[PDB]
Amino acid sequence: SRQPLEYVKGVPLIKYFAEALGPLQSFQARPDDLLISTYPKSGTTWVSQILDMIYQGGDLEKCHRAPIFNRVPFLEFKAPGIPSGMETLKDTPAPRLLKTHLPLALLPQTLLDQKVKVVYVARNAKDVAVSYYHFYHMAKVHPDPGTWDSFLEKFMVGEVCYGSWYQHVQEWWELSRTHPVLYLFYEDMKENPKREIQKILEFVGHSLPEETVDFMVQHTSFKEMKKNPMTNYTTIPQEIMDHSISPFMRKGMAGDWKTTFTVAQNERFDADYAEKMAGCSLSFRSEL
C-alpha cells in the first residue's frame, strides 16, 4: 500500500480507484438513481445516512442491515480485499443511492444522460484540508501525506487524491445551473440539520412527518453516527483504515481548522483562495 497517486485525465487518484475506472465504463445509470457527490471529507457519510433513512421510511432497524458503504455503493471504489463499488452494486436494489467524489471530467456519462438526481455537499476548504490530512493517515491506501505544512501545500495545488477542491466545488456549482442538483453546505447542515433535511425530502419528492424528521435529525447527529458501527467504518478492515491513528468520525465540527492552521498558513491560504475563487457566486462560512 501507500503507493503514489496515479493520474487520469488530469485527476490524481489512488492506484486502486484508477483501475476501478475500467469496470466503471460498463456502468448503466437508471432514471431513478440518486447520486451523492462530494469532494472528499465534505460530509458524504452524513448525507448518505440521511438519504438512506428517507429511503427506508425512517425505520432504523432497516438501516442497520449493512454498513453505509454497502448500503450506498461507492462508484469509483475498489480496494485490495473487499468488493468494488461495481460489485456491491450488482446486488443493489432500486431505487439506488450511489456515492462518488469524481470530478465531472471523470464522471460516467450515463449519469448525465439519464438525468440522475444529484445531491452535492460542499464544505469550507480549510476544514476539508484538516479533515483530509487526518484522513490520509488513517486511510492507509493513500500516499504519505507528510507533515501538515507539506500536505497543505499539495492541497492548494490539488496534488491530492481527487485533485483541486476549488475545481470540484465550482464545477458542480455550475452544473447545478442546469442539471437537477441539490447543492448543500456542510455548515448549513451543522447550523440547522432539520432545515437541510426538509430540503432533501422536498428534493427527492418524499414527504415525512415531523415526529419522523426530528427522529432523523437525531440519528444523523455526529455523536449518534459516531456510535453506530453501521456508519463509523469500524468494520472496514484495519489494513484499509486504522481508527487508532485517527477516527473516521473525528470532530464533526465547523471551525476546527483554527487549531491546526498557523497564522502564516492562514494568510497564504487566504491570499491564494481569493485568486482561485475569484468571479464565483459560491460563498462559504469558515465558522459558526
Ligand SMILES: Nc1ncnc2c1ncn2[C@@H]1O[C@H](COP(=O)(O)O)[C@@H](OP(=O)(O)O)[C@H]1O
Ligand atoms: N453526522 C455528522 N455530522 C457532522 N459531521 C459528520 C457527521 N458524520 C461524519 N461527519 C464528518 O464528516 C467528515 C467526513 O466526511 P466524508 O463522509 O465526506 O468523508 C469528517 O469530518 P472531521 O474530519 O472534521 O471529523 C466526519 O467527522
Ligand SMILES: N#Cc1cc2ccc(O)cc2oc1=O
Ligand atoms: N482505501 C480507501 C478509502 C478511500 C475513501 C475515499 C473517500 C471516501 O469517501 C471513503 C473512502 O473509504 C476508503 O476506504
